[PDB]
Amino acid sequence: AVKVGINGFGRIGRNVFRAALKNPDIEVVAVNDLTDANTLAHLLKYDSVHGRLDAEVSVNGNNLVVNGKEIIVKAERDPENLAWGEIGVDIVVESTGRFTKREDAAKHLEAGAKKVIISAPAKNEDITIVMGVNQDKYDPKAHHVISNASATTNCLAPFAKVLHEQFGIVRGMMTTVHSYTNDQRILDLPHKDLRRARAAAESIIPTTTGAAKAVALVLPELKGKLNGMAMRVPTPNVSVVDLVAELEKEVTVEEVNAALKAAAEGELKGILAYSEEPLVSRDYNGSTVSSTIDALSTMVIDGKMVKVVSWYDNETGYSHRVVDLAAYIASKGL
Amino acid sequence: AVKVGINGFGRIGRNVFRAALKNPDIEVVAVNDLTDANTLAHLLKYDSVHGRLDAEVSVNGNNLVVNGKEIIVKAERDPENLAWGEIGVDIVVESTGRFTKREDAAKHLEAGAKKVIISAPAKNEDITIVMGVNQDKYDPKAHHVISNASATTNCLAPFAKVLHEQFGIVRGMMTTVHSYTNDQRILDLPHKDLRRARAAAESIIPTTTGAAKAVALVLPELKGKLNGMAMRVPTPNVSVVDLVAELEKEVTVEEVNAALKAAAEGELKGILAYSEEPLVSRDYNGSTVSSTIDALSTMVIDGKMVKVVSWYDNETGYSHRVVDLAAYIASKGL
Amino acid sequence: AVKVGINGFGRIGRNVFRAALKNPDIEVVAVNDLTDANTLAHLLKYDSVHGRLDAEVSVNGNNLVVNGKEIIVKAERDPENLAWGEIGVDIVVESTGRFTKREDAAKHLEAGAKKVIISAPAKNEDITIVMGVNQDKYDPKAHHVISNASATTNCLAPFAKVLHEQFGIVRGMMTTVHSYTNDQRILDLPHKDLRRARAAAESIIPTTTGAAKAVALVLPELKGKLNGMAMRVPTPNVSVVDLVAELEKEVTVEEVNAALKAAAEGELKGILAYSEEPLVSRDYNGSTVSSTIDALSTMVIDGKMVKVVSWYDNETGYSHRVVDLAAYIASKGL
Amino acid sequence: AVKVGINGFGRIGRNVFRAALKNPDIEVVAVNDLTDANTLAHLLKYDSVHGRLDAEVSVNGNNLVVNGKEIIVKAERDPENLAWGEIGVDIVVESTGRFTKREDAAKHLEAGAKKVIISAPAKNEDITIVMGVNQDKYDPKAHHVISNASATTNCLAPFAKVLHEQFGIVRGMMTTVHSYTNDQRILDLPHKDLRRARAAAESIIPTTTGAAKAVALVLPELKGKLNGMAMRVPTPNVSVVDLVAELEKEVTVEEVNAALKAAAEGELKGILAYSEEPLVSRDYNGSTVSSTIDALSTMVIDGKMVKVVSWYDNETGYSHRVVDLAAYIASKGL
Numbered sequence A, B, C, D: 001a002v003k004v005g006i007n008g009f010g011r012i013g014r015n016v017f018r019a020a021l022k023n024p025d026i027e028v029v030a031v032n033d034l035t036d037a038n039t040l041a042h043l044l045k046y047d048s049v050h051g052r053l054d055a056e057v058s059v060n061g062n063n064l065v066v067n068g069k070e071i072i073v074k075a076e077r078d079p080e081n082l083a084w085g086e087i088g089v090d091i092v093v094e095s096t097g098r099f100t101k102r103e104d105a106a107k108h109l110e111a112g113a114k115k116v117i118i119s120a121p122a123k124n125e126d127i128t129i130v131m132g133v134n135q136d137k138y139d140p141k142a143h144h145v146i147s148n149a150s151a152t153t154n155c156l157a158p159f160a161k162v163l164h165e166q167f168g169i170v171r172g173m174m175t176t177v178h179s180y181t182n183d184q185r186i187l188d189l190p191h192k193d194l195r196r197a198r199a200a201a202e203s204i205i206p207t208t209t210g211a212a213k214a215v216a217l218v219l220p221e222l223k224g225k226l227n228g229m230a231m232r233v234p235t236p237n238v239s240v241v242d243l244v245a246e247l248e249k250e251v252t253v254e255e256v257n258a259a260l261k262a263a264a265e266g267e268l269k270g271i272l273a274y275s276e277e278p279l280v281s282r283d284y285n286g287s288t289v290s291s292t293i294d295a296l297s298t299m300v301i302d303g304k305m306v307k308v309v310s311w312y313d314n315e316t317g318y319s320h321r322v323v324d325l326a327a328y329i330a331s332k333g334l
C-alpha cells in the first residue's frame, strides 16, 4: 500500500524489510547503504542470526529481486541526494544510526519523502512513539520526523504502563542484559564510550541507557521516576529488561502476574506477551512482540517492591514495531 | 603452619590451592578428586581462565609435587574413607559441590579432620561466615562445620553492610549477571533446573541465587528484606552484583559512593574495593577482593532508591576468602 | 511402519526423533534416558540450536505426547532392562555414547530388539555403514549390531569416494574444525582426553579422531591411505572437513569441482551436495545432507595435491542418516 | 637507541609498544591513530586480551606518559602529514592496515622517516622478512620499505624451513585456524570479503590467505610448492597452523619431531619452540615466539606425507618480531 524506503540496510534495516514482507499494506521500493546490490542481496539472503530468508532473492542491475518484486538500491552517503520523491517514497525508515538528529533526518523530507521514522532515540524529533502506548498522540499535521525509540524502551514501556495504571509506580530502576550490537567493538578499538570500546564477545560490559528516562516520553506520568543501565554480554541477539519498582498499591506476585497476563491478552496483545515457561534468550530469537513477561521471575518484598523480568528480540520485535508504526502513520493520511 | 586438605580439586579447589601458595600460615598437604595425579597436575599447571601457574609442578608416583613439596593425591568418592587424621590434616576445604549438607560434610570430621569449610551455602552447618562481615562470630569451641557462603553473597554482604549501617536498608532486590559454571550444561542436557539445562555459552539464562536471603545469615538485621535472582551469561569467569535498594535516610549519589569508598579504604580494605574507572569484566579476572564497587554506575532516585553495582571474580576472590578463613580459624586454636 | 526405540535422548537422540517425524516409514514408540518425561518434553520442545519444535508436545503420565502420538518414556541405566520386545520395538538407536562396544549394544537384542544402530564408531560391530557409500554391504542375516559411523566419517567418505574413483587417492590427511559437543567440558574438568578437559567455549582444542581411518571400513581401497585429527572450536553446531590428498592423476581445480558436482547431482544426490556460495557455518545449521562441498575453497598445488573442504551439520545430517539407515535396514526384512 | 614511531596504535600497534618497553635498543617516541590521547592511554592500560599493562600510564596534553617517558600522540589520517623527520623518528611501524602498498607506506619516508616496516603482507615492498629465516637478505642501501609478513607466515616459514632442509618438501597445503581480528564484523555488515562480513563470534569462517604463498618470499626454493587457506573462529587471540606436506623421502613422526625440536633448541631458538604438552589456544596467550610445534599432533601417513601443527599468538609473537626486525634494521645503519 504505502511506499517505503529504508536508509541503512543493516540489522534493523534488513529485519524491518523481513517484517515488511509480511505486511501487505507496506511496500519497500528502495533501500540505501554504502555498498552494492550484490552485497546487500547476499546479506539479506543469509543471516547469521535469523537464518536463510524464506524467499527468492537475486540481483538485476542496481536492484534487489525478492519474489519477483524489484527493490531499488542506492548508495548515497548524504541522504539529501536520495531523491525519494522521484520514486514516490512517502515513508522513510532512517536506520543508519548516524542521523538521529532532526536536522539530519529531515534531509529525507527535503529529498521528497513525506514522513521519516528514526529507528532509535532521537534529538529534537517532533514526537516519540511506542506502539501500544502512545500512538494516539501522533499528529499527521505536526509530526513528520518520528522516533520509534529504542528496543529497550519498547520492551519496558508496555509493562510499565500496566504496572502504573493498576498499581501506580512511585519510583523504579532497571537493567537490561543486552546482546552486543554493531555499535560495539571486536577487539579494543577507539569508542566515545570507553566501555563499548572493549572486546564485545569477551566481557560483561556495563553501559548507559536512556531507555528508563525515555519511557517518560511515552508515559509522562513517569517523568523523573525511572532510571537504569545496560550490561552488554556475549550473545548475538535477544535481550531482557529487569525492573525493580516501588508501587503505590500493596500487591502479591499472583496479582502482578495476573494483571500482566490480562494486558497481554487485551489492550497490549501483539505488543506484550506473557510466559510461564522457564526459557532462555535463544528461545526468543525471532519473537515479534516488543515485550514478553517472564512470569516465573516475578517477585515482591513487603508487598511494595516488585521485580518484573521481560524478554525481547531487539532485532525482530523492534523491526515489526517500525513496520506497524509505518502502517499506522499511513492510515492517518499522508 | 596449619595442615589443609582439599576435597574436590576443581575450579575453587585449585584456585584455593593457588591462593594457599601465597599464605605461609596454610599448608595444603593433600587433595582428593576422581582422577589421577597426572590429570590434576596438568589442570593445576594450565588454566584456561587464570593462565599458567607460576610454580614448579610435577608428579612423583601418584602424588603431586609443587615447588619441592609433595602433595598426597587421593581418589575416594566417599569422604568417610579419606582418613584425614592419619596425615595430620586439621582443616578440610569441601569443594566438590556434592557435600554441602552437614551429614556429608561431617564425614571429614569422622575421618579425622578438626574443621570443615564448605565452599558454598550449606545445610545444618554450625555457622555461615563472610570475611569482613561476621568472622568475629566464629566460636572455635562450638563451630566445626563452617560455610563460607557463595561468591555472590561474599560480593553483596560487604557493601550491604555499609549501606545498612550508614543509611539503613528498608528492602531491596538484586540480580547477579554471572559467568557460567560447571553446574551448567554445554548443549541442552537434563538438569534439575530446566534453565541451567540449556547451552551455557549460547544464551542469557535466568536462574536462582540464594545470595539475597543468605545475606541474612551474616547480617541478621537484613532478614526478610532482600531477594534476587541470577542471569548466567556466556563469559567463563567474573560476575557482577546489581542491587536496587530503598534506603531509610535520604541520600545523594556522592554520599553513597563516599561511604563505600571509606569502607573500602578502611575496615573492609582487602575485602571491598572501590573503582571510578569505566572497566569491563575481563579487567577483574584475577582480582582477589570479594567485591569492587563500580562507582560510575551508582545512581539514586528521590534520594530514597539506590542502585549499587559491584564486580567480583567468583573464582579468585572467593578462593582467597576461603584461605583467609582457614588462617583465621587456625589463629583461634585447633 | 517399523517401530523404533531410542536409547539416549540427547543431541542425536532428539534430532533423530525430529528426522523420524518427517519419515512415514519409521515410528519412534519409546525413548530411554536418565530423567523424567517432563524434562525430556521440555528439552524436545525448546532446542538452543535448532529452535522451537514445530509440533504439539505434552506429557501424559510417564509418557510423552507428540502430535497425538504417545511416546513411552523409560529411565533404565542398564539397556538390558529396556524390554523392547514387549512393546514391539524392532530397531533400537543406541545414542547414549556409553554402549559402543558390541557386548553392550547387544544388550538391546537380549531385551527383545532385532537390530541396533550405534550412532557412532563402534567396537566389534557386525558392520559399519555410511549411507551412499556401502549400505549395499548390509546383510540382514548376519548384521544385527550396526554402526552408522561418526558424522565426520559421513562427511568425508562420500567425497573421498568421488576423488578416489575419478583421480585415485595415493594418500591424504584431514582435519575437521568441529563445533564443541557434550563430551567436552564447560570449565577445565577431569577428562581422559586432557585436551577435551579444557573450557570448550574458550579455545581451539586439538583432539584425535578416527574418521580418517574409519573411512577404510566403508571404502576398503582407502585402507592405510588416510589419517587426520580434529580441532574443537567455540561454536555450538556445524563442522567442516578439510582434506588434503596426493592424487594419482594430475588435475585442475575446475576438474575436481566438476566431478564433485556431477556426483552431487547424480550418484550421491541427497548425501553429497555442492555449493559455490561464500557461506559460513551458521548457514549450514539445519542442513540434512551428509556433506556439502565448499567449491570456492577447492585448491590444487603442483597438479597432484588437492584440498577439498566440506560442510556438515554434525547433528542434523547425521541424524537423518540414522533414520535413512533404519528405513533401509527395515526394507531388507526384520 | 633507535627512535621509532607507530602508525596505527591498534592490536599490533599497542602490543608492539609493549614489546618495545622490554627492548632497551628501541625507543617509541610517537604514535599516531584517529582518536585522542585519553582514549589511547585507556586502551593501552587495560587490554581485554593481555590484561593490565604493568607500567604507569597517564596523559599530558597530546602525549602519553609511560613510566615518566613522554610519548607524542598524533591524529593525522594522512601519513604524509606526520612529520617524522622533525622529531627524529627513523623507523616507522605501519600498522593501520590501510597502507600496505609501497606507494602509501612510502608516505612515511616523504615525511622524514628513514625506514618503514609494514606489519603485514605488502604490495611492491622492497623486501619481505621473517626473522630467523631471511633477515640476512636485508640490504640497508636498497631496502627502505620492508614487510614483516603476516603472523601466519611467521609461524609457517620457520618450520617449513626445517622440514625442507631436513627432508625436502615436494609440495604442501596449509590451513590456519585463526582467532577473529578487527578486520571482521560483529554482526553481518558489508565487507569486500563476503565471508568476513558475517558475525565473527558465531561461525567458523573460511577466508583466503596468501601466507603459504608468501613463504616463497623468504624461502625462494619453496616457490610454487605451497598454498593454503584460513578459518576464522570465535576466539579473541592465538591461532594455529596446520601443514600437510609431501616429502622427498620417507620419515616417521619421531624423526620429524626430533628435527623440529633440534632446530628450536638450536638455530631457531627464540623463533621456533617445541612442545610435547597437550595444550589448547588459551595456553599460548602471551607466547613471544613465532611458532611452537604441537609435537603430539605430528602425524605421518604412508611414509611420505606429514602433518605438522604449530601454535602462534598472532598479537604477541608477531609484535615481538616487529621489534626484533626494527633492532636488526637499525644495527645495519640508518
Ligand SMILES: NC(=O)c1ccc[n+]([C@@H]2O[C@H](COP(=O)([O-])OP(=O)(O)OC[C@H]3O[C@@H](n4cnc5c(N)ncnc54)[C@H](O)[C@@H]3O)[C@@H](O)[C@H]2O)c1
Residues within 6 Å of the ligand: A007, A008, A009, A010, A011, A012, A013, A032, A033, A034, A076, A077, A078, A095, A096, A097, A098, A100, A119, A120, A149, A150, A151, A181, A182, A183, A314, A315, A318, D187, D189, D190
Ligand atoms: N541492533 C539492535 O538491537 C537495535 C534495536 C533498536 C534500534 N537500533 C538502532 O537502529 C539504528 C541502526 O542500528 P543497527 O544495529 O541496524 O546498525 P548496523 O550497523 O547493523 O546498520 C547500519 C547500516 O547503515 C549503513 N550506513 C551507515 N552510514 C550510512 C550512510 N551515511 N548512508 C547510508 N547508509 C549508511 C551501514 O552500512 C549499515 O548497513 C541505530 O540508530 C540503533 O541504535 C538497533
Ligand SMILES: NC(=O)c1ccc[n+]([C@@H]2O[C@H](COP(=O)([O-])OP(=O)(O)OC[C@H]3O[C@@H](n4cnc5c(N)ncnc54)[C@H](O)[C@@H]3O)[C@@H](O)[C@H]2O)c1
Residues within 6 Å of the ligand: B007, B008, B009, B010, B011, B012, B013, B032, B033, B034, B076, B077, B078, B095, B096, B097, B098, B100, B119, B120, B149, B150, B151, B181, B182, B183, B314, B315, B318, C189, C190
Ligand atoms: N565456580 C564458582 O564461581 C564458585 C564460587 C564459589 C563457590 N562455588 C562452589 O564451590 C563448589 C565447587 O564448585 P566448582 O565450580 O569448583 O566445581 P567443579 O565442577 O569445577 O569442581 C568440582 C570438583 O570436585 C570433583 N568431585 C566431584 N565429586 C567428587 C567426589 N565425590 N569426591 C571427590 N571429588 C569430587 C570433580 O571431579 C571436580 O574436580 C560448589 O559447591 C559451588 O557452588 C563455585
Ligand SMILES: NC(=O)c1ccc[n+]([C@@H]2O[C@H](COP(=O)([O-])OP(=O)(O)OC[C@H]3O[C@@H](n4cnc5c(N)ncnc54)[C@H](O)[C@@H]3O)[C@@H](O)[C@H]2O)c1
Residues within 6 Å of the ligand: B187, B189, B190, C007, C008, C009, C010, C011, C012, C013, C032, C033, C034, C076, C077, C078, C095, C096, C097, C098, C119, C120, C149, C150, C151, C181, C182, C183, C314, C315, C318
Ligand atoms: N553430537 C554430535 O555432533 C554427534 C554426531 C554424530 C554422532 N554422535 C555420537 O552419538 C552419541 C551421543 O552423542 P550426543 O552428542 O547426543 O550426546 P549427549 O550427551 O547429548 O546425549 C547422551 C544422552 O544419553 C543419556 N544417557 C547417558 N547414559 C545413559 C544410559 N546409561 N541410559 C540411558 N540414557 C543415558 C544422557 O542423559 C543424554 O541425554 C555419542 O556416541 C557420540 O559420539 C554425536
Ligand SMILES: NC(=O)c1ccc[n+]([C@@H]2O[C@H](COP(=O)([O-])OP(=O)(O)OC[C@H]3O[C@@H](n4cnc5c(N)ncnc54)[C@H](O)[C@@H]3O)[C@@H](O)[C@H]2O)c1
Residues within 6 Å of the ligand: A187, A189, A190, D007, D008, D009, D010, D011, D012, D013, D032, D033, D034, D076, D077, D078, D095, D096, D097, D098, D100, D119, D120, D150, D151, D181, D182, D183, D314, D315, D318
Ligand atoms: N591482529 C593480528 O593478529 C595481526 C597479526 C599480524 C599482522 N596484523 C596486521 O597488522 C595491521 C593492523 O592490524 P590490527 O589487528 O592491529 O588492527 P586494528 O584494527 O586493531 O588496529 C588498526 C589501528 O589503526 C587505526 N587507523 C586506521 N586508519 C588509520 C589511519 N589512516 N591513520 C592512523 N591510524 C589509523 C585504527 O584506529 C586502529 O587503532 C594489519 O595490516 C593486519 O593485517 C594483524
